[PDB]
Amino acid sequence: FGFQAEISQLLDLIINTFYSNKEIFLRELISNSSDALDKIRYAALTDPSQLDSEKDLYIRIIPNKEEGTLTIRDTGIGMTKADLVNNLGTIAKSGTKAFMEALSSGADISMIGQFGVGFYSSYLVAEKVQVTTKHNDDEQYIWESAAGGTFTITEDTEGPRLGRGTSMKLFIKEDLKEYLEEKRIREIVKKHSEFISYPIQLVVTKETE
């Protein structure tokens, strides 16, 4: 069995209980994006053609107040279906074990990505996440995540093409729409992501009124 319903319920409950500073979700997403960007930058050293699917390496944040969503897209190396399968099965089970053993030992759990389950820190602010990903060696896939969900990985033949990389669309919880506001987003990136050595872009939209 996969146990994704059980694992996502547990992590949703544990993460929201013990991390009262919800804004670190954006630190974990940018840090995962940065890691994936390092991977394609390195692969392109020996094979320049790896960048033919997308020449620019960046992270872009796209709020949408009408949809209630925050989207973080990068042009990193992306994930094959094998990669996403490995994350949903092997990594989720093992990292959950390490995460809550560190919880239970009173260890310092502030850097949650350390345990490989940094993805689920999205649950601090989001009630569901849609993962789109494209790796040079596979097709574009989409997978939906929610606390208790058992959605299947599906070939994305309807969404916009990524070229290469990963796009995380977070459906923001009702009482937390503050994380869709420009000034709040910019504050959070400045505070938690000074170390990042790729461009971080934010899409702002003119208001009417």
Ligand X SMILES: COc1cccc(-c2cc(Nc3cc(O)cc(O)c3C(=O)N3Cc4ccccc4C3)n(C)n2)c1
Q: Is 166 in the site for ligand X (CB under 6 A)?
A: yes
* Tokens coding 78: 């992306």
- 147 contact, one of ligand X, Cl ion, none, CB 5-8 Å limit per kind: none
Cβ of residue 107: shortest distance to ligand X, in angstroms? 19
Residue 156 burial (C-beta neighbours within 10 Å; 0-12, 13-18, 19+): buried
Q: Are 192 and 200 in contact (CB under 8 A)?
A: no
Q: Is 63 in the site for ligand X (CB under 6 A)?
A: no
CA pair distance 91, 105, nearest whole angstrom: 21
CA pair distance 107, 26, nearest whole angstrom: 23
Cβ of residue 28: shortest distance to ligand X, in angstroms? 7
Backbone angles phi, psi at 148, to 5 degrees: 95, 0
- 35 contact, one of Cl ion, ligand X, none, CB 5-8 Å limit per kind: ligand X
Q: Is 80 in the site for ligand X (CB under 6 A)?
A: no
Is 93 marked within a binding site?
Answer: yes
Site string for ligand X, 6-45 (x = CB under 6 A): -----------------------x--xx-xx--x------
* Tokens coding 144: 């939906």
Using CB under 5 A as the criterion, which residues of the chain lie in contact with Cl ion when the complex forms? 65, 205
Binding-site annotation: residue ranges: 28, 32, 74, 79, 87, 93-95, 114-119, 166
